[PDB]
Symmetry: D2
Subunit: 380 residues, 4 copies
Amino acid sequence: SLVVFPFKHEHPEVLLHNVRVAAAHPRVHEVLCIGYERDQTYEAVERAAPEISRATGTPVSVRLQERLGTLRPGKGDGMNTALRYFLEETQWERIHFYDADITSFGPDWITKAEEAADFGYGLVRHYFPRASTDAMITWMITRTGFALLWPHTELSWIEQPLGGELLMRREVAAMLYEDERVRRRSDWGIDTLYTFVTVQQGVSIYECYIPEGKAHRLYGGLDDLRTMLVECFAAIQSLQHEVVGQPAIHRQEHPHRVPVHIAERVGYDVEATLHRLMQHWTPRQVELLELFTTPVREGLRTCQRRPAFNFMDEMAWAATYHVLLEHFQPGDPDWEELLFKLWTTRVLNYTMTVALRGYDYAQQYLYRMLGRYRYQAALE
Amino acid sequence: SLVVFPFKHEHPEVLLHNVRVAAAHPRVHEVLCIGYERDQTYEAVERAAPEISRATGTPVSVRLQERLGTLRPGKGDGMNTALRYFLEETQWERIHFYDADITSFGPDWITKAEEAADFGYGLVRHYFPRASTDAMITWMITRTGFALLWPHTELSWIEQPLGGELLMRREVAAMLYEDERVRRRSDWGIDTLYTFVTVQQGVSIYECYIPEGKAHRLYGGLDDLRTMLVECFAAIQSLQHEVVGQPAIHRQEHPHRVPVHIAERVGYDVEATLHRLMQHWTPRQVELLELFTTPVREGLRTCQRRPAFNFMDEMAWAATYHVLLEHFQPGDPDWEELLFKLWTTRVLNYTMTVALRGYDYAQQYLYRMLGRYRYQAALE
Amino acid sequence: SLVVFPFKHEHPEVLLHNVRVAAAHPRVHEVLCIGYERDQTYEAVERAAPEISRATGTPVSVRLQERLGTLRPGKGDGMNTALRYFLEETQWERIHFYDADITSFGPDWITKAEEAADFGYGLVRHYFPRASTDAMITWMITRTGFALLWPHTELSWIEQPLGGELLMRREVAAMLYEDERVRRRSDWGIDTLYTFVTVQQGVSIYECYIPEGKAHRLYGGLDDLRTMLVECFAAIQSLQHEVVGQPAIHRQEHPHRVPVHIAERVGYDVEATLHRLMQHWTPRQVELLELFTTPVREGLRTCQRRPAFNFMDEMAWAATYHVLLEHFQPGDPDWEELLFKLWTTRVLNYTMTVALRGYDYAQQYLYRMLGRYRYQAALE
Amino acid sequence: SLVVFPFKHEHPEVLLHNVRVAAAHPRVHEVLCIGYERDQTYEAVERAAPEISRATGTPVSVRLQERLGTLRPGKGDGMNTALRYFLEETQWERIHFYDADITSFGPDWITKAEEAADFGYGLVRHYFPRASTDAMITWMITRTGFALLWPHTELSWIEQPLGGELLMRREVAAMLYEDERVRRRSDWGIDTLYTFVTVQQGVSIYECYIPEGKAHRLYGGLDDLRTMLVECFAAIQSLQHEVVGQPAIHRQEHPHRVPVHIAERVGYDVEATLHRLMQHWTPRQVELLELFTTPVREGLRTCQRRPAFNFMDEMAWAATYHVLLEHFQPGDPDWEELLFKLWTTRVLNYTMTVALRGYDYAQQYLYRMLGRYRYQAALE
Ligand SMILES: [Cl-]
Ligand SMILES: [Cl-]
Ligand SMILES: [Cl-]
Ligand SMILES: [Cl-]
Ligand SMILES: [Mn+2]
Ligand SMILES: [Mn+2]
Ligand SMILES: [Mn+2]
Ligand SMILES: [Mn+2]
């Protein structure tokens, strides 16, 4: 197998430790790191690589990403360059991807994926325990979108549709590389696209549970997720007219109880988030709210003077999601700020009325949210 | 819809309460009770029925089961009688079954099933939280069997393959009642057969989670499960050469955290169970053990003098299961007793080495068990 | 024993149920309800009493509170009137108090307190499981005060020093009724005084765990807690030069795991709380902040424009507490509102950075909080 | 401070690690290891001392225990030799003891004990989270005894009265070493004796919570606790007529949630334990049962043929405890075997009816058990 680590700016020791782990693994025949640019990290890996490959007997290489997509040059270009490398320059049967900022990586992850793949699956997705306020794009954006647009499919049931840790066999990789919808998603939307297209093509999927979790880079206020947010949404919007006549085999490793240290952390800075909700207003944003239901429109307007979020419950969010699907303009700064404020209030609402009731309550709640979304969507 | 309660010997007030709940439900058009014989319970329901249907506007009736199968006349004959009544004597589009001895039934259960059916599913199964020592036939016999025999199918993933609580749509009922394999399963094997063939014909299945659990009749020593145990095993064994098939298609409501009162109970009497392990021995049973691996043969023999069960771990059990599949003679008193003792030691082993480590630990274990069994099966 | 229910405004059926429960108890010889005014509730009880007292054989009566203290006529006058009645007009050996608004009251509570009293203890205090956002005056005012001022004593170790549910023996009641420090506490400060002086007097104390919790009247925003906040702080402040001897007998029934329904609730409405933090400002309050450390002064100032609360950790709170003890003027509207805003940020800081982390986490944290406060006070 | 490690037979690397941790600690001035005999361990430590005593600047020495007591030469003689060395040959103000076989020791333990000492306490006891089937002597013998014989005292409230981990100040050590009751307890009984007399003399006690637990040597069947069992019982019996007539001050650090890895282990081998129950019978033992209540007499007699333990609930156990206190003969092999079997059935009972219900349930139970024992004792 080929193992890939896409990296942008990361601590060299962190990624070098992972590369080391993969190279040492009996089933890994090559490690590739795909860089955004020739930085500190790049230089480090390149210097370490020859040594590592000699030590482990398995070749390690670094490359810059190629520009293959048409949106912002980001993670997509990174991953798809790896798909190209894999398909056009190696003979390997399987490719793994793992995010480079992972600090809890172990041979573990590789073994479990390889063993599922031996069982027959086309795509193996790793998924992890999560803190109740983690994964707010995954839930409020990706899984929500999937539930609302494709209720009868397996899409909304994928646990971590955004997750960078996965194993594809060669023909699944070939299919994804050759698809032009995926190819052009050069930005953060890449994972959404891999997820959507493998499901739509009926690839059989296994979700692998990694118990010790995914310990990686942590967030301040919500707005260091802002690009990713707009991009992940734009990805769902771009797919909204797709049909998914059937269907994919899909099994999930049964999850263990969350580790305590993972359940007991806050995924973001509340005070800062509340503050930011009052900032970067624009007469045009105010005007754009004329497109939304009254509670949401009054709701968000209040945010110019003081934080408001009680209004953004489940039902308001679904209403908001439809208006966004239909009017949101990718790349318009006002639409992007508006989507950001809107998602913010959904996350604050959820944090204060649900997450604050406990880990378990908040999981019951998210699952039951998707179900309600699916039911509602199936009804029209 | 038609709602059916199969009853053998139960407290009239318990069943009458359930009937009342069903009849009151806005989506129920008929309630049917299927009795084993004309006993106390039967008489109670028959007297109450005319009154209840007048009170609720939906017809309620009682009938004896018909002899439709060829094994012991038991629950199968009751449920298949209901299928016949449903298909040949009503116009209804959906049939529910619920065990009569349920004391936590509410409109709840009916609504949830009817809603999933509206979504599109062909079979909706109710499943419940469980005490770590509950459902030992489900786990050690039914799900084990499905994992060992059909690893690439959805069979071993069904949560409660013995569950009496389900909704079928008319065409699914028609298909089952027509199937001779199922029709003949007059005994406890019926539920196994419903589970097996619906999966094998690619019916689409939703598992509904009932959070407040299923509070019903409780067990003393393991041996008041003994007929059920031999009959449920016989059912797996009778299907052992089937193939399969289609995919199809299977989704589970996400389970909530187990209620405390359900996690904090012991599902059987350990002392009695150890005692019973030493009883009903037979020279022929001692002989029949010659057919089993050494640790098991030596293990079970010790049980004539004192209780032994540490030998019966996962791998020993799987080995045992294969010898049983291939040599167990349904209806042979020595084979039945032996299966009983064998299974007892497995339950005891699980109780002392797994269940005693906690509710969570014991669930991780059982799920992981089925996975190991599936991996091992797919290896040959 | 005498059982007393102090009431101000409550639902008659709620209180009447409680009175009925007490009157039926084999150990209860008299039930007394102490009212604030002759309202609806009062009239209800007085009509119902003669019956009850006939139905159960134990006398039930209602009286208005007397004016005995010198602060706001509130709960203190209510409870001390009971003490006077108990001592001067009855021969009973033991008095219980229970809040009238309790909806989870049962013979239970009485039995457990009477049995501890039999063991010998002078005072028996009932304590309950709590939601992580409950009891923010208990924690951030009373237990905090106790730790910071009397670190070597048993004070900060009482679980629920504001608790209205307790049993005293006659001599304890006589001691309290005779103390003018307690007598004058006519307002909400009464429970703090009962707690303080029985500890100061080396009364032996037993804390009795009520597992089903105390289900009573719930709160909106934090600010319907305002009068109780300022009067509970005033109480601590009034005691600040007291010296407390050396630790008596104090024993606590071991707490069970919190019930899920109690752990899973939010104890207040976060939006309204953030809003209220920006209201009722005054140029004098702004000036008064010149008395506080820089972080807290700048922190609270920001609240005129947007909610700010991250500055208010543990140590800032302690610092602020010290400034309050020394400068807070009871009865001054600006000091009162200032105290209110200050507490509010302790509570918000704590909800966002600690409660959000889990029920367990937030309890570890509060206990470790008192310990850090004790250590710090001990240090000078 | 002097830190002492008593050792009999242990792995050098385990003990040597702990020695290293103590010596490195800024508050430790001398480390002493007290050995049973000049074995492997002894030789290892003696070789290493020197080296350690020298990379830390704090002297480390080993000695053989002296024969100071009059029972079996065991732990008592070791601990008391340490006391003697401490008092007669050093100037240090405080002595710690830690078990040698601990594998989770860290500077931690010493710091916490030293800081409590600094706060004033005369004895600091470390206590740890436990598996539900751990500590069966502590609960069913020591704490039970304390609760039945001294209900009004602090004795049964000490969390780990057998714990080897504690800090005494010089005067408390002096007092204990001077006490002939403790001096003669040369065997396992020593810890019971330190616990009893420090409480009896009104030494003020702090219990220190060590969250990471005490990882040490594990048990097979219950019978490798057999000498310890009889000696610990003998200890309580020898003290049965003592009077306890003052307050100790007694405070317990609030415990954190049990770590999962500690909650999820089985503390013994059930199958072996059941087998052992049927062994080493004797006509005299059968006779001696004549002294016990009928359920217990008939119950234990069944154990000659098959394991029986349902009879040994709480109340049977208390009854049995009283018969033992009054008739058990230390050093009589039949009384010793009988006590062992009796206690085994108690442990089995608690295991199957209680521990199997969950970690929390089992703790609620043990605490409530002492409660009931205390109430019952206080009633006569
Ligand atoms: Cl996310
Ligand atoms: Cl079962
Ligand atoms: Cl409070
Ligand atoms: Cl022990
Ligand atoms: Mn990341
Ligand atoms: Mn049943
Ligand atoms: Mn109240
Ligand atoms: Mn040990």
